[PDB]
Design a protein around this ligand. Structure first.
Ligand SMILES: CCCCCCCCCCCCCCCCCC(=O)OC[C@H](COP(=O)(O)OCCN)OC(=O)CCCCCCCCCCCCCCCCC
Ligand SMILES: CCCCCCCCCCCCCCCCCC(=O)OC[C@H](COP(=O)(O)OCCN)OC(=O)CCCCCCCCCCCCCCCCC
Ligand SMILES: CCCCCCCCCCCCCCCCCC(=O)OC[C@H](COP(=O)(O)OCCN)OC(=O)CCCCCCCCCCCCCCCCC
Ligand SMILES: CCCCCCCCCCCCCCCCCC(=O)OC[C@H](COP(=O)(O)OCCN)OC(=O)CCCCCCCCCCCCCCCCC
Ligand SMILES: CCCCCCCCCCCCCCCCCC(=O)OC[C@H](COP(=O)(O)OCCN)OC(=O)CCCCCCCCCCCCCCCCC
Ligand SMILES: CCCCCCCCCCCCCCCCCC(=O)OC[C@H](COP(=O)(O)OCCN)OC(=O)CCCCCCCCCCCCCCCCC
Ligand SMILES: CCCCCCCCCCCCCCCCCCCC
Lengths: 504, 605
């Protein structure tokens, strides 16, 4: 019922942001703010009225809300939306990150702010549609429609200090990676649909109907490989990862594009929702390769993050390492590891959002991003180094922050499954602490290594400090009280885990 | 007794207020907030102890909420209070209050006053979380928070990069220890299904009746986490380097909080270590070797803070030796007494540093007894308690209990190592005392020094921790055996002090002869650098890490997946050569395609 409005309110808001630019240059930011305010209010209303804490696991499918409309009846294609605990959590996270993205670009008084705002809303609507669609063609449609505004924002509104050609190259590389992976996913979807059509005789793209599809061993492996290649590009999983630091480096200076669609983890939701239930035996066979890819991703991202002289690339490689942790969690087949994966994705979204916002503020003050041109900024700034210290301690897995809770539940479930990957991942956590301390001391501690870092800098604004402290409060409350988030997603995790382990 | 959570709430409130003050408050107001938060923490601890002794030493449990509940994985936010928890809580709160008062005097005129007090208040709150936790995950929360506060306080002077490097080393080595502790947590939850200490002890022997390898592994990783936190073998190298922080930070880390967490972890999970005797024997061996190496390192050192650091390392080795000989009560008693006299020694060392206009070399120092009598008497009684001077100091009674517990349990070599370590302890302690305080001259802070002065004497040994019914009783020694053991320990301490007076109180003529000899300089260079452990961990863990980072800084996998892009570019550039614009070549290509199509149709027919 409210799911089509949840998807369509960003699109109508973006159209109104573009159209209301003639009323004034300061108008579209307010329109975008009310748009994500209404979206977040609807998401919280769905959270309150869903009764997710009292919902028990009944088996796939089990949706707390559901909408259906025929879209292409020739192929049996429908606009078919469904929300449950995991999808509702990611929709709430999408709404909150969109609110933060609108609030982060409040000072842009550019003459074409309407198109920037419209592209931001179209990105957010695409992410919401990805999290809500349970039709394969519709899910793929959202998966690929959310990339065009990201491309145009990176290419046209990106890093102004860098050359234009670097922005074009980064946007084109990101688009090529994501769309080629999406086309491989579309081939896998089409082959699965044709297998189901040959088995039964009905045209369908609905994910509930494609679950009970008899596939030979090896065909299911190929379909799982196509799905996993798409999700591994978007997660990212090594070596399908360089698009993420390249796009983060040439992103807009405010950082709203990072918060809009890049930092929201749709690929692991696709792995939990689509890769494991549709192909359970193939995923059980693929689990060692995927989890060793996760181990390699954790250590590779840690070694890249330690070696970066740039803050944005550093945080991108932190994202690579944490997504390696989540990838290890997904193929365990454990309820505890899955709940820890959900907590880890939410906490990583919050922590990386705070880190990227603070990096944007720091670049605004000091007009550079190289870590060799700064140092000793604790005495030159009022609020920024302490909040950046809090977020850097958050991403190394410190208790009191939700990252520790998510990573430790992941490792508990994984050790209940496999010990060696767990112990290597915990040494990866040591590596994560290493790169966090390296970033902290190259950025804010020591003596000034240039001239711009030796001058006093203006403090952060009240709205910006308000949203940063809101992120701080949310991370602390997730670290100390993660229970409502756990009972929200307990039914979906239970259904996915029971389908994965009862069909292998 | 219901105010058990206030001992965390008050330091947390103080930390939050002093962090969000951002130095805008006055130094008097910031000092009042910080030392008042720790003072009401100590006062609530005193009321808790009064109610605990009035209730007949009953173990108290106060749940607050459930931290996580995922199926069988149930971790709660519950605090527990037994005799051991009360002992460590009283030690942390009282010694931290005294250190906070001395810091309120000491940090005057310094930048970062409120930041310092907020970090110390968070340190105190995290230690109360550590010592009050009833399950392993809450104790891990306190463990990691204590490590974070130690990292934040070691590199307090952020302008000097050496402090930052020391903070990195401390946090990285302690994080490796915490990862080993995490391994222990994972094994224990996988085998027993719970992390509560009582429940783990209850369901351990029923589950481990057939196989004991997993419990042995869990206790081994518990020992690894303990030696990571307590600066023992093989994770001890961070202490000396991370000694670059302020004096109250050093006193809080070395006496009150940080190095006693491993001892508390071994004593709290003593049942699991009791059903795995080889791991407990390894605890004893690790403590003996660590105390011997720490004594030999402190013998030849030229920095007073570093000497006190290796003295603290030797005392934690003594506590680990006491834990390895199942002398748990002796270990906790030595923890309390060592906290008292090490806090006194560190605060008096800070007074000496301030009086000697920021000089930290002992050989530059000389004749400070005449300049400052009170600090000299502080150093005298602190070194007498550290060297176990008989019948007047609490350290003598603590080490006597440790050695009697080692002797009564049939551990002969550990007792011999303890006697040798006591000899070397008196040696380096009075060596540094005689070098600093003898030779040729070249109400806020007095009260904690006086309180620690009283507590470093036999009055500190008059306090007995209520560990009966929590930790098992040590086996009793014979009257003649304990008498000759006390006589031997006193004789060893007096002989060490007298030979230190023979060597360093007068002109160091034969000492220079050993120092300048080739085997003497070899041994001095070996013991000065902590037996090459820091060099080994630099060449085995740091340098290959830096080399791999330098090799991978160009992202080889990115180039590996960019190889198809350059292949496509090269193929397109090569294929564009066919578009030369010549019509005759176009007709020739059409005829070539006709030949190819016809030949392919004839072959495949
Ligand atoms: C896990 C592996 C198996 C599954 C793979 C699934 C496919 C998706 C994930 C892999 C995608 C790899 C894409 C690599 C190229 C990325 C795009 C890129 O780098 O574009 C920038 C580049 C131009 O940049 P620049 O050099 O600055 O230009 C100035 C020169 N005049 O542009 C160029 O140089 C031209 C780019 C041409 C188009 C891109 C190359 C297409 C190659 C085939 C794509 C399908 C993948 C097939 C398998 C490849 C091998 C794994
Ligand atoms: C560059 C990017 C794209 C990659 C290249 C393009 C895709 C390549 C796909 C190669 C597939 C090779 C298949 C080889 C065997 C074919 C014959 C066969 O065994 O057919 C079996 C079956 C037809 O017999 P049937 O009676 O229908 O039995 C039903 C069985 N469940 O067959 C069926 O029912 C249909 C079988 C479909 C198999 C899956 C095809 C798509 C899989 C996803 C994409 C490829 C894998 C991922 C990417 C790899 C790296 C790029
Ligand atoms: C311009 C130039 C540059 C750009 C272009 C570069 C090249 C692009 C094209 C690359 C891909 C080529 C085709 C790869 C797929 C081949 C499929 C195949 O041979 O399938 C055979 C068989 C089919 O299964 P079948 O036996 O029919 O099962 C039914 C009865 N059991 O299959 C099986 O039985 C299962 C076989 C599984 C292993 C084969 C698939 C490997 C996929 C490699 C990529 C993914 C690796 C894993 C993930 C890494 C990280 C993402
Ligand atoms: C680790 C340190 C020691 C712990 C205290 C501080 C922790 C961090 C403070 C911020 C986060 C707090 C999150 C929890 C707040 C209380 C809400 C709560 O958990 O309620 C649950 C419980 C009632 O529900 P019940 O069913 O009994 O619980 C089982 C759960 N299904 O509720 C009850 O039974 C009542 C519990 C009351 C607890 C009051 C604690 C006040 C703490 C003030 C701290 C101020 C500074 C905060 C920031 C510090 C730095 C991060
Ligand atoms: C829980 C009990 C203990 C158990 C172990 C817990 C371990 C994990 C704890 C996580 C919390 C964060 C710890 C580290 C924070 C360090 C922040 C810091 O350094 O603050 C000091 C700084 C003022 O220092 P100063 O240099 O004087 O000022 C800047 C120059 N003008 O301050 C500032 O500049 C302003 C304040 C900056 C941020 C302070 C900390 C924020 C996070 C904690 C509070 C969150 C909000 C409270 C409510 C939560 C929800 C109930
Ligand atoms: C002890 C015996 C048992 C073994 C247990 C496991 C290993 C324990 C290792 C203990 C010693 C660790 C020492 C770490 C020192 C860190 C501080 C330091 O040296 O900082 C200097 C430098 C600062 O960084 P930056 O700002 O970039 O400056 C560049 C310098 N010009 O920063 C650096 O140079 C970065 C240093 C990174 C250190 C990474 C450590 C990785 C540990 C991996 C553990 C593996 C466990 C398994 C081992 C094999 C078992 C078979
Ligand atoms: C998807 C976005 C998640 C943001 C972080 C949320 C973390 C959970 C916070 C829950 C509220 C904690 C504080 C209030 C506790 C109220 C308890 C009521 C029942 C006793």
């Amino acid at each position: 019922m409210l799911l089509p409005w949840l998807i369509l309110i960003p699109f109508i808001g973006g159209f109104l942001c573009w159209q209301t630019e003639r009323f004034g240059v300061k108008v579209p930011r307010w329109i975008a703010l009310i748009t994500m305010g209404l979206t977040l209010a609807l998401s919280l209303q769905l959270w309150l009225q869903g009764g997710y804490s009292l919902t028990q696991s009944a088996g796939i499918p089990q949706w707390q809300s559901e909408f259906d409309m025929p879209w292409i009846p020739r192929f049996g294609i429908s606009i078919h939306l469904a929300i449950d605990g995991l999808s509702l959590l990611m929709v709430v996270l999408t709404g909150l990150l969109g609110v933060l993205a609108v609030l982060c670009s409040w000072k842009e008084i550019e003459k074409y702010q309407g198109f920037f705002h419209l592209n931001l809303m179209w990105i957010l609507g695409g992410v919401i549609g990805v999290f809500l669609a349970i039709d394969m063609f519709l899910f793929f449609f959202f998966w690929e429609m959310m990339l065009v505004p990201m491309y145009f924002l990176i290419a046209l509104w990106g890093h102004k200090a860098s050359d234009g050609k670097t922005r074009i190259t980064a946007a084109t590389k990101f688009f090529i990676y994501t769309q080629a992976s999406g086309l491989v996913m579309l081939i896998a979807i089409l082959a699965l649909v044709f297998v189901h059509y040959n088995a039964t005789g009905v045209w369908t793209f609905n994910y509930e109907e494609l679950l009970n599809t008899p596939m030979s061993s090896g065909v299911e492996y190929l379909l799982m490989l196509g799905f996993f290649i798409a999700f591994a590009v978007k997660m990212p999983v090594v070596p399908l990862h360089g698009w993420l630091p390249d796009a983060h480096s040439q992103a807009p200076t405010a950082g709203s594009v990072d918060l809009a669609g890049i930092l929201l983890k749709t690929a692991a939701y696709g792995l939990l929702r689509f890769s494991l239930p549709l192909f359970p035996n193939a995923s059980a066979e693929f689990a060692p390769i995927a989890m060793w890819l996760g181990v390699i991703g954790i250590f590779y991202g840690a070694w890249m993050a330690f070696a970066q002289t740039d803050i944005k690339r550093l945080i991108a490689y932190t994202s690579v390492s944490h997504m390696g942790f989540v990838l290890i969690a997904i193929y365990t087949g454990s309820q505890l590891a899955y709940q820890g994966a959900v907590i880890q994705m939410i906490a990583h979204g919050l922590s990386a959002a705070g880190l990227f916002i603070l990096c944007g503020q720091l670049y605004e003050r000091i007009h550079t991003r190289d870590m060799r041109m700064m140092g000793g900024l604790w005495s030159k700034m009022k609020w920024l180094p302490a909040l950046s210290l809090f977020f850097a301690v958050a991403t190394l897995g410190m208790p009191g922050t939700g990252n520790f809770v998510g990573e430790f539940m992941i490792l508990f479930g994984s050790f209940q499954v496999v010990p060696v990957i767990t112990v290597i991942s915990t040494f990866g956590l040591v590596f994560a602490s290493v790169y966090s301390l390296a970033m902290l001391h190259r950025a804010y501690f020591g003596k000034a290594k240039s001239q711009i870092a030796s001058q006093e800098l203006p403090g952060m604004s009240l709205r910006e400090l308000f949203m940063i402290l809101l992120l701080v409060v949310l991370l602390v409350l997730l670290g100390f009280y993660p229970q409502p988030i756990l009972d929200t997603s307990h039914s979906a995790i239970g259904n996915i885990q029971q389908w994965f382990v009862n069909s292998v | 007794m219901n105010m058990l959570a206030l001992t965390i709430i008050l330091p947390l409130i103080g930390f939050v207020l002093l962090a969000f003050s951002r130095g805008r408050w006055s130094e008097n107001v910031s000092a009042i907030v910080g030392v008042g938060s720790v003072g009401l923490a100590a006062l609530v601890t005193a009321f808790i102890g009064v109610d605990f002794f009035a209730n007949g030493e009953q173990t108290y449990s106060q749940p607050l909420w459930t931290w996580m509940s995922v199926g069988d994985f149930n971790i709660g936010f519950n605090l527990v209070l037994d005799g051991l928890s009360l002992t460590m809580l009283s030690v942390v709160t009282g010694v931290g209050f005294l250190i906070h008062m001395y810091a309120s005097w000491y940090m005057r005129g310094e930048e970062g006053y409120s930041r310092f007090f907020a970090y110390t208040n968070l340190f105190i709150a995290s230690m109360v979380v550590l010592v009050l936790a009833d399950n392993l995950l809450l104790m891990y929360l306190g463990w990691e928070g204590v490590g974070l506060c130690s990292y934040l306080l070691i590199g307090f002077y952020y302008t000097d990069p050496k402090n930052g490097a020391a903070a990195m080393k401390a946090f990285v080595v302690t994080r490796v220890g915490d990862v080993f502790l995490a391994f222990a947590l994972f094994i224990l939850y996988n085998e027993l299904g719970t992390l509560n200490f009582r429940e783990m002890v209850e369901l351990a022997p029923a589950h481990f009746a057939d196989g004991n390898n997993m419990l042995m592994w869990a206790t081994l990783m518990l020992l690894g986490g303990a030696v990571g936190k307590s600066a023992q073998l093989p994770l001890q190298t961070w202490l000396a380097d991370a000694m670059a922080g302020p004096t109250p930070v050093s006193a809080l880390i070395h006496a009150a909080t940080m190095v006693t967490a491993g001892v508390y972890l071994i004593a709290r999970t003593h049942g699991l270590f009791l059903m795995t005797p080889e791991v407990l024997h390894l605890v004893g061996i690790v403590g003996a070797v660590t105390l011997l190496l720490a004594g030999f390192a402190a013998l030849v050192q030229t920095d007073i803070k570093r000497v006190l650091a290796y003295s603290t390392m030797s005392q934690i080795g003594y506590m680990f030796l006491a834990l390895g000989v199942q002398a748990w009560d002796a270990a906790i008693f030595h923890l309390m007494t060592h906290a008292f006299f090490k806090a006194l020694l560190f605060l008096a060392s800070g007074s000496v540093i301030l009086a000697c206009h920021h000089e930290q070399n002992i050989f530059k120092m000389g004749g400070l007894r005449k300049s400052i009598p009170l600090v000299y008497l502080c150093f005298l009684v602190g070194g007498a308690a550290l060297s176990a001077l008989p019948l007047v100091t609490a350290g003598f009674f603590s080490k006597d209990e440790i050695l009697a517990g080692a002797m009564a349990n049939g551990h002969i070599n550990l007792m011999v190592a303890g006697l040798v370590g006591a000899f070397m302890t008196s040696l380096y302690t009075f060596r540094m005392i005689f070098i600093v305080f003898h030779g040729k001259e070249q109400v806020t802070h007095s009260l904690p020094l006086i309180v620690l002065l009283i507590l470093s004497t036999f009055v500190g040994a008059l306090i007995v921790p209520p560990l009966q019914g929590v930790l098992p009783q040590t086996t009793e020694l014979a009257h003649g055996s304990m008498l000759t053991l006390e006589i031997t320990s006193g004789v060893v301490a007096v002989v060490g002090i007298l030979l230190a007076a023979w060597l360093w109180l007068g002109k160091r003529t034969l000492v220079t002869s050993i120092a300048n000899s080739a085997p003497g300089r070899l041994l001095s260079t070996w013991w000065y650098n902590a037996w090459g452990f820091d060099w080994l961990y630099d060449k085995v863990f740091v340098k290959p890490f830096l080399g791999i980072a330098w090799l991978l800084k160009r992202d080889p996998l990115n180039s590996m997946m960019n190889i198809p892009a350059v292949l496509s570019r090269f193929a397109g550039k090569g294929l564009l050569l066919s578009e030369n614009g010549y019509l005759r070549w176009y007709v020739a290509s059409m005829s070539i395609g006709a030949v190819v199509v016809l030949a392919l149709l004839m072959v495949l027919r």
